[PDB]
Each structure stands twice: as structure tokens, then as C-alpha cells.
Design a protein that fits this description.
part of a larger assembly, 1 chains, mainly alpha, 2 helices, 90% helix, rod-shaped, Structural maintenance of chromosomes protein 4, cell cycle, essential for the functional organization of genomes
């Protein structure tokens, strides 16, 4: 138990925390692309009207 705690239950736990941070960055860049596309078709619809 202590060996797994000091080897991977803590270090690989930090690795998984960094992976979850990367997951959050994925949602952040997805929202960024969504806002970009939103402004894009907003300007496009304004010009089209």
C-alpha cells in the first residue's frame, strides 16, 4: 500500500491532474473556436442582410 502510494498513487495522480488540466484546455480552445465561428457567421449574416 505504501509503495503504491509513494510510487504511483501520488506521482501518477499528479500526472492525471495534468491530464485533466489538458482536458480543460481542450474545452477552452473549443469554446475559443466556437466564439470565433460565432463572430464569423454573425458578420456574415449582417453583410448578407
Amino acid at each position: 500500500v505504501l509503495e503504491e502510494y509513494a510510487r504511483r498513487l501520488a506521482e501518477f495522480k499528479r500526472r492525471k491532474l495534468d491530464l485533466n488540466n489538458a482536458v480543460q484546455k481542450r474545452d477552452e480552445v473549443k469554446e475559443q473556436l466556437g466564439i470565433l465561428k460565432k463572430k464569423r457567421f454573425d458578420e456574415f449574416m449582417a453583410g448578407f442582410n
